[PDB]
Amino acid sequence: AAQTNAPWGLARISSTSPGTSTYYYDESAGQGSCVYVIDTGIEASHPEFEGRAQMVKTYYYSSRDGNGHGTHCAGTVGSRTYGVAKKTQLFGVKVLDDNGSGQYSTIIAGMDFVASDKNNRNCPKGVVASLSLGGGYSSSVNSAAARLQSSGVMVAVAAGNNNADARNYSPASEPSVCTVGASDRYDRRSSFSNYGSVLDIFGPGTDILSTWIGGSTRSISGTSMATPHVAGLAAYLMTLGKTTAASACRYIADTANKGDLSNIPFGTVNLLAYNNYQA
């Protein structure tokens, strides 16, 4: 399949080169997979989700996304126009309040929730979790992320936006998950992107168009935007049978575009997520 005039990040993840505008992907499109978006919620009523999104948990007075961040991330995973995996099932877990804040005990509860809740869902092709959030290092947050991964979920986490070593942030610093840095449309490391040995992969993260609350769209930037490209890519590859939740981060790194990015500090991987789709 070919989507013309796609957002640049979608075009990038199906290309060996920067500077193109068509997203190429197998029509299976993540059908039969599931992605949990652990964030501020998802506006499931957005036409872009086509009935494939739903809220499954909140820790606040409402499950509504009053912020937008979670809706945007979900759109990059799986919206019809803006998403990588256009037929995946999207499940929202609101661990962050409408101000974007979440206590670590709530984030941990939400990760343990997903590890259990997947057993209540139909995801024959596999399960992914996208965590575009974090804070300072916490062993308990990292352990929660490690348990979620161990339970059979492909966990993708944002590296953070401090232009610093991700080793000092959580869940970014948990080794066993897939820690995602951000790039821009000219194949530069995004200026804000964290880096370091704990990064597994980069994805598009600067000036990413996606869904927003109120049935709208907008372009924003962050490692938060890179993470759902990788989460969506994992769901897509799982549907194709190319990998599994335990192996997807390795598979994505194995099959990535190598050496394309600039301003990658010495000791950080130079790997950009790539679907290797050949019509």
Partner: peptide, 4 residues
């Protein structure tokens, strides 16, 4: 935490 905060959103990224």
């Amino acid at each position: 935490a905060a959103p990224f």
